[PDB]
Design a protein around this nucleic acid. Structure first.
Ligand SMILES: Cc1cn([C@H]2C[C@H](O)[C@@H](COP(=O)(O)OP(=O)(O)OP(=O)(O)O)O2)c(=O)[nH]c1=O
Ligand SMILES: [Mg+2]
Ligand SMILES: [Mg+2]
Length: 342
DNA sequence: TCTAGGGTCCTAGGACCC
DNA sequence: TAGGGTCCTAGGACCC
């Protein structure tokens, strides 16, 4: 009763698209991210920049100290979305069991697949080859019996490569697998896990479920399961977006409500335009605002509201600005909408 | 170096219902 | 009849 799960993951996705579309960027360090003056971070970088230590989520001022010649790009999100549509149509030639996780990646359940003699290894190879032939972009893949192992496996032969984990190989693979490599175990959890002497799935195997349940709640059960290779999550091809958000970080902090209002006036049309693509009548469940301060504390207030409304968002931002802000500079204003359920 | 913007999921207290 | 459900809401870890 073993499933065959493929995780497919595009290599340096945004940057790979910019190199295809402008070959002059192929061999110099490049990154998509906001400028240092715009107070940006790196979205992603190519391998020449990664050589200097440039990473996703790194503040752009840090990226340039590490890599002074870094060529900074703004991002062409329609070009990326077009590549995403194409690779997802390529996935559909092999199975309809496709769960996209983002523009550039998806789980595939190929258990019931007729292609390539039921070899998930060969299906993954053929998808990567087709992606390259039709889009001139490379992808990596991971093949495993469950989601999270397949997703770990796609990172291990990057770029332009794959890795297969059989059920026979799972116990040896788990024994030394760092917990931080498990999707959903981030910095905060890994440091809390490290402080009680838990670093690897091997360590957690030597643990009692009851203790993990008391110390981490439902997260403790997931830790216990993952450390054994247990991941029963099904590939779900029916997920739908639940929210729409539009926010901006200013080059300089703002200190006057007139400035905040001015920002919202620019944000609102963008939010209405993106909402209208999915809900033309603009009917919603909740709408709300977000402020982020000088000191990086962040607050949101949102409420039941039936239809996108600019003045109510302005009013809500006014309350949050007056009430909870105490003469701090504001670095970010955001608008937010929660979509109706169905 | 100085910290984005797109999101998902979980948690928790009080309101509210019974 | 002392407590059991289920929304509302804010915050925060985490993902790409
Ligand atoms: C991780 C991350 C990705 N992204 C964007 C840019 C990435 O190219 C795109 C896909 O994310 P990832 O697949 O996580 O990163 P990647 O494709 O650039 O690198 P890799 O070759 O290691 O898979 O999502 C961000 O904007 N911010 C982030 O923090
Ligand atoms: Mg990728
Ligand atoms: Mg990815």
């Amino acid at each position: 009763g073993s499933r065959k799960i493929i995780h497919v993951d595009m290599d340096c996705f945004f940057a790979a698209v910019e190199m295809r579309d402008n070959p002059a960027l192929r061999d110099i360090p490049i990154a998509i991210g906001g400028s240092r003056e715009r107070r940006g971070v790196i979205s992603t970088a190519n391998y020449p920049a990664r050589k200097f230590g440039v990473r996703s989520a790194m503040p752009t001022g840090m990226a340039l100290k590490l890599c002074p010649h870094l060529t900074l790009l703004p991002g062409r999100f329609d070009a990326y979305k077009e590549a995403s549509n194409h690779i997802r149509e390529i996935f559909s030639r092999y199975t309809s069991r496709i769960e996209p996780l983002s523009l550039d990646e998806a789980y595939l359940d190929v258990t019931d697949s007729v292609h390539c003699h039921g070899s998930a290894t060969l299906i993954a190879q053929e998808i990567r080859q087709t992606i390259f032939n039709e889009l001139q972009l490379t992808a990596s893949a991971g093949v495993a019996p469950v989601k999270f192992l397949a997703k770990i496996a796609s990172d291990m032969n990057k770029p332009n490569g794959q890795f297969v984990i059989t059920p026979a190989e799972v116990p040896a693979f788990l024994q030394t697998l760092p917990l931080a490599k498990i999707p959903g175990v981030g910095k905060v959890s890994a440091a809390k896990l490290e402080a009680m002497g838990l670093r690897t799935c091997g360590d957690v195997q030597k643990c009692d479920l009851v203790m993990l349940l008391k110390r981490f709640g439902k997260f403790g059960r997931i830790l216990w399961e993952r450390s054994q290779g247990i991941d029963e999550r099904d590939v779900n091809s029916e997920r739908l977006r639940k929210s729409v958000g539009v926010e901006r970080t200013m080059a300089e902090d703002i200190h006057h409500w007139s400035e905040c209002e001015a920002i919202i006036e620019r944000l609102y049309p963008e939010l209405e335009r993106r909402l209208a693509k999915v809900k033309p009548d603009l009917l919603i469940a909740r709408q709300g605002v977000k402020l982020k301060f000088d000191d990086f504390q962040q607050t949101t207030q949102e409420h039941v509201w039936p239809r996108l409304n600019k003045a109510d968002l302005i009013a809500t931002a006014r309350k949050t600005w007056d009430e909870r802000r105490g003469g701090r500079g504001v670095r970010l204003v955001g608008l937010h909408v929660t979509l109706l359920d169905p």
